[PDB]
Every structure is written in C-alpha cells, then in structure tokens.
Amino acid sequence: MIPAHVPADRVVDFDIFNPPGVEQDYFAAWKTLLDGPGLVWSTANGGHWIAARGDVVRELWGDAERLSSQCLAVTPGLGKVMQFIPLQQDGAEHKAFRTPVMKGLASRFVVALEPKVQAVARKLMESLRPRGSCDFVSDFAEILPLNIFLTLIDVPLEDRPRLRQLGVQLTRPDGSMTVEQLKQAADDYLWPFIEKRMAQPGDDLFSRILSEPVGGRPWTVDEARRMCRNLLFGGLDTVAAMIGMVALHLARHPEDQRLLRERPDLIPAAADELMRRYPTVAVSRNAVADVDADGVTIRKGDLVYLPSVLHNLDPASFEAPEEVRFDRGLAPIRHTTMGVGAHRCVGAGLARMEVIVFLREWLGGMPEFALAPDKAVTMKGGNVGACTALPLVWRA
Ligand code: HEM
Ligand SMILES: CC(=O)/C=C/C1=C(C)CCCC1(C)C
Incomplete structure (x- = not known):
C-alpha cells in the first residue's frame, strides 16, 4: 500500500542496499534512477523517498532545518544507538558541537599532518610492492584508513601493532554483531585514548578537539564518546x-x-577530479516539516535518501560527468561528495590530502599496475559503496 501524498507514477522498488548491477558497477546501478522521475518513493526497507536528480539531491541535502539528520539511516534503531556527534545533530546543538570539531581539523593541521600521513601510506605500499599482485581492497584500502587514524591521534609507536589488530575487527564487515555491540566495541576501543587525552591533552586530533569548549561549557564524557566514535567511523x-x-x-x-608519473605536479588536481568522479556516499534524513520538491510534498515523518552520485554524475547538473577532465575549474564544495551545507564533511580538507599522498606514494614508488586477467572486480551497495574485491598485478 502506498501513502496518499505519493503519486503512483513515482513508485519504485529500488533497494538501496542492492541496486541491481551494484556488484558489477556501483554507479551505473544508481544511474538508472536518472531515466525516472526526480523524486521517487521506494517500497523497500519500510517505505521511503530517494532523491533521483541532482537539483533534488542537492537542494534537499542542504535543507538541514526541515530534514533532520537524526534517523542516521533507514534501518530502524541504528540512529538511536550510534548517536554520532556532530553527524546526527540539528540546529544550534549541531552548530555548537561542529565549531570545535571543525577547528580540530583546520588547514594548518591537515597540512602539518602531511609528512606523517604520507610515510604511513608509503610504509604500506612498500609492504606490498615485492609481491607483484594484491587484493587491493583487503590488503590496502581497508588497512590505510585505520593506520592514519592511529597517526591522527598520535598513539606511541610500540602500541601501533597491538592497536591495529584490536581495531581490525570493526573496520568493519556488516556482519552478525548488533548495532549495539558494534558501538560498544568501538567505545571500548576508543575509551583508553580518550582518558589519556582529556587528562593530559597533547597536540593530536582528539586532544585538540577535547580541549575546546562546546558553546562555552566543557565537553561531557559521553559527548566525547559520541564525537570520537564519529571521527573514527567517519574516517x-x-x-x-x-x-x-x-x-x-x-x-x-x-x-x-x-x-x-610524468607530471606529478598534476596530482592535486587529479585527486579533486577523481573524488568528484567516484562518489559513493549516501545519507538519510527524516522530515520534521513538510517539504515541497520536484512538484510534490514530503510529509513530516517521511524518510529521505540522498545518493551523492545522482548529483555529481547527473549529466543534467554537470557536463560529461563521467569524463575525468582538467578544465572544469570546479571548487570541490560545488559537488556533493563530502556532502553539502551545514553537514559537509569536517574531514574534506584531510580526505583530499589523504588521497593526494596516496597518489604521490602509489604512483612514485609503484611500477605500472593493471587489473588481473582472471579475477573480477566487484562492488557492494549500502550507504558507503565500494569495491569488495580489486585484484591488481604488476612486475615486482
Ligand atoms: C573518503 C573521504 C570522506 C568522504 C567521502 C566523506 C563523506 C562525508 C559526507 C558525505 C559527509 C556529510 C554527511 C551528511 O551530511 O549526512 C561527511 C561528514 C562527516 N565526516 Fe566525512 N567523509 C570522508 C572523510 C572523513 C574523515 C577523514 C573524517 C574524520 C577523521 C570524517 C568525519 C566526518 C564527520 C564527523 C562528519 C559530520 C559533520 C557534521 O554533521 O557537521 N570524514 N563525510
Ligand atoms: C552505520 C555506520 O556504522 C556508519 C555511518 C556513516 C558514516 C560513518 C559516514 C557518513 C554517513 C554514514 C555512511 C551513514
């Protein structure tokens, strides 16, 4: 059964956890919703809206006042549990908490972090280069984000090996452990780091954030719990x-x-264009006020799903979106990879550096790689799309 306020022509059954063809190609899978109305209602997953044209994706994603970030996801009970700070807050609460978190991730700090984050990226590269091949997802992509985390909070080097294992369970698969247990496992992982740094603040990421006030007052212990978790996971x-x-x-x-490899001076620009080119994040909102859009109305209560790839790769919003070209003059905030509006990734600057440093080490130190001849590339769906297997070969 469909609600009165949803025209029957807008009804689809698209399932956001498996768009069909998602395994073969994440983006085409999503891109099929372009041949349809700009805002449709999906019967899967308990019934919700999906934004399906870049103007709609972009406009709704900015409506932070009428579209709350509180449900976190379309899966019931998951928002209630994780309570991400800032990611799940509205209005003034969200303004207060964002300020010092943001300030923790300021340019000069990302910039200062460059050398250290590169060496990490390089060390991992070197542990693979002798092999002539690798499952790049399981051997690199899934492993660098935690390493860098370790380096952002500056854990002492002795501990890093023990802390990488501890951490590996929760980066991340799925995966028959409740939403609740998941959050317990990351709080437990994170807690020791929090005690040390609310006690003896250093000059790493967390200390910096934890010594700033939140609208004038000091962080409570739970807020830091919520905000750290959020940095971990968000990263x-x-x-x-x-x-x-x-x-x-x-x-x-x-x-x-x-x-x-010839024009390494071209890596920054290519990062920005690659990041515009392959965005795989999608977010949910819950309507707190009735919102008109694309000539229809979303009602208080309705869930809304926002795939960034329907903005960046909508040819109606960007010329030849699937071309990696170097003459767009596009500022990154003009596309929706890292989001839009009040909720726009604090970690933008850092991600972009992250990617750059990867390019710099991966292209400098490595020889010419290619896809393996007899192993497929496959991706997955959900909120953060990704390859689940990427077999790569090269002459050592
Ligand atoms: C691959 C790089 C990244 C991508 C594609 C990405 C994507 C996003 C997107 C789309 C949002 C907006 C979410 C929304 O409006 O619902 C977001 C926000 C957020 N990101 Fe990232 N992110 C990245 C890296 C990071 C990193 C490196 C960190 C920190 C270590 C991080 C921490 C956060 C946090 C706390 C927010 C919430 C901001 C708020 O509500 O004010 N992210 N990210
Ligand atoms: C449910 C969960 O464990 C992950 C939640 C998320 C993070 C950290 C990044 C931005 C939004 C999203 C993709 C929902």
Whole structure:
C-alpha cells in the first residue's frame, strides 16, 4: 500500500542496499534512477523517498532545518544507538558541537599532518610492492584508513601493532554483531585514548578537539564518546572506498598512470577530479516539516535518501560527468561528495590530502599496475559503496 501524498507514477522498488548491477558497477546501478522521475518513493526497507536528480539531491541535502539528520539511516534503531556527534545533530546543538570539531581539523593541521600521513601510506605500499599482485581492497584500502587514524591521534609507536589488530575487527564487515555491540566495541576501543587525552591533552586530533569548549561549557564524557566514535567511523569506510575507487581508476586507465608519473605536479588536481568522479556516499534524513520538491510534498515523518552520485554524475547538473577532465575549474564544495551545507564533511580538507599522498606514494614508488586477467572486480551497495574485491598485478 502506498501513502496518499505519493503519486503512483513515482513508485519504485529500488533497494538501496542492492541496486541491481551494484556488484558489477556501483554507479551505473544508481544511474538508472536518472531515466525516472526526480523524486521517487521506494517500497523497500519500510517505505521511503530517494532523491533521483541532482537539483533534488542537492537542494534537499542542504535543507538541514526541515530534514533532520537524526534517523542516521533507514534501518530502524541504528540512529538511536550510534548517536554520532556532530553527524546526527540539528540546529544550534549541531552548530555548537561542529565549531570545535571543525577547528580540530583546520588547514594548518591537515597540512602539518602531511609528512606523517604520507610515510604511513608509503610504509604500506612498500609492504606490498615485492609481491607483484594484491587484493587491493583487503590488503590496502581497508588497512590505510585505520593506520592514519592511529597517526591522527598520535598513539606511541610500540602500541601501533597491538592497536591495529584490536581495531581490525570493526573496520568493519556488516556482519552478525548488533548495532549495539558494534558501538560498544568501538567505545571500548576508543575509551583508553580518550582518558589519556582529556587528562593530559597533547597536540593530536582528539586532544585538540577535547580541549575546546562546546558553546562555552566543557565537553561531557559521553559527548566525547559520541564525537570520537564519529571521527573514527567517519574516517574508515569512506576513505577506503575512495582510495579503492582511485586505485580502480588507475588500473583501468594506464594512460593516467603515465600522465601522473610524468607530471606529478598534476596530482592535486587529479585527486579533486577523481573524488568528484567516484562518489559513493549516501545519507538519510527524516522530515520534521513538510517539504515541497520536484512538484510534490514530503510529509513530516517521511524518510529521505540522498545518493551523492545522482548529483555529481547527473549529466543534467554537470557536463560529461563521467569524463575525468582538467578544465572544469570546479571548487570541490560545488559537488556533493563530502556532502553539502551545514553537514559537509569536517574531514574534506584531510580526505583530499589523504588521497593526494596516496597518489604521490602509489604512483612514485609503484611500477605500472593493471587489473588481473582472471579475477573480477566487484562492488557492494549500502550507504558507503565500494569495491569488495580489486585484484591488481604488476612486475615486482
Ligand atoms: C573518503 C573521504 C570522506 C568522504 C567521502 C566523506 C563523506 C562525508 C559526507 C558525505 C559527509 C556529510 C554527511 C551528511 O551530511 O549526512 C561527511 C561528514 C562527516 N565526516 Fe566525512 N567523509 C570522508 C572523510 C572523513 C574523515 C577523514 C573524517 C574524520 C577523521 C570524517 C568525519 C566526518 C564527520 C564527523 C562528519 C559530520 C559533520 C557534521 O554533521 O557537521 N570524514 N563525510
Ligand atoms: C552505520 C555506520 O556504522 C556508519 C555511518 C556513516 C558514516 C560513518 C559516514 C557518513 C554517513 C554514514 C555512511 C551513514
């Protein structure tokens, strides 16, 4: 049965956890919703809206006042549990908490972090280069995001090996452990780091954030719990997918690989264009006020799903979106990879550096890689799309 306020022509059954063809190609899968109305109602997953044209994706994603970030996901009970700070807050609450978190991730700090984050990326590269091949997802993409985390909070080097294992269970698969247990496992992982740094603040990421006030008052212990968790998680799944799609891109365009080994001065621009090119994040909102859009109305209560890839790769919003070209003059905030509006990734600057440093180490130190001849590339769906297997070969 469909609600009165949803025209029957807008009804689809698209399932956002498996768009069909998602395993073969994440983006085409999503891109099929372009041949249809700009805002449709999906009967899967308990019934919700999906934004399906870039103007709609972009406009709704900015409506932070009428579209709340509180449900977190379309899966009942998952928002209630994780309570991400800032990611799940509205209005003034969200303004207060965002300020010092943001300030923790300021340019000079990302910039200061460059050398250290590169060496990490390089060390991982070197542990693989002798092999002549690798499952890049499981051996690199899924492993660098946690390493960098370790380096952002500056854990002492002795501990890093023990803490990488501890951490590996929760970067991340699925995966028959409740939403509740998951959050317990990351709080337990994170807690020790929090005690040390609310006690003896250092100059790493968390200390910096934890010594700033929140609207005048000091962080409570639970808020730091919620905000740290949020930094951890916000930094793992998305970065890996991205680093993944970038290594993808290069295995399938060896000519870029040469453009880039020849013109390493071109890496920054290529990061920005690659990041516009392969965005795989999608978010939910819950309507707190009735919102008109695309000549229809979303009602208080309704859930809304926002795939960034229907903005960036909608040819109606960007010329030849599927072309990696170097003459757009597009500022990154003009596309929706890292989101839009009040909720726009605090970690933008850092991600972009992250990718750059990967390119710099991956293209400099490595020889010419390619896809393996007899192993497929496959991706997955959900909120953070990604490859689930990326077999890559090269002459050691
Ligand atoms: C691959 C790189 C990344 C991508 C594609 C990505 C994607 C996003 C997107 C789309 C949002 C907006 C979410 C929304 O409006 O619902 C977001 C926000 C957020 N990201 Fe990222 N992210 C990335 C990296 C990071 C990193 C490196 C960190 C921190 C270590 C991080 C921490 C956060 C947090 C806390 C927010 C919430 C901001 C708020 O509500 O004010 N992310 N990210
Ligand atoms: C449910 C969960 O464990 C992950 C939640 C998320 C993160 C950290 C990144 C941005 C939004 C999203 C993709 C929902």
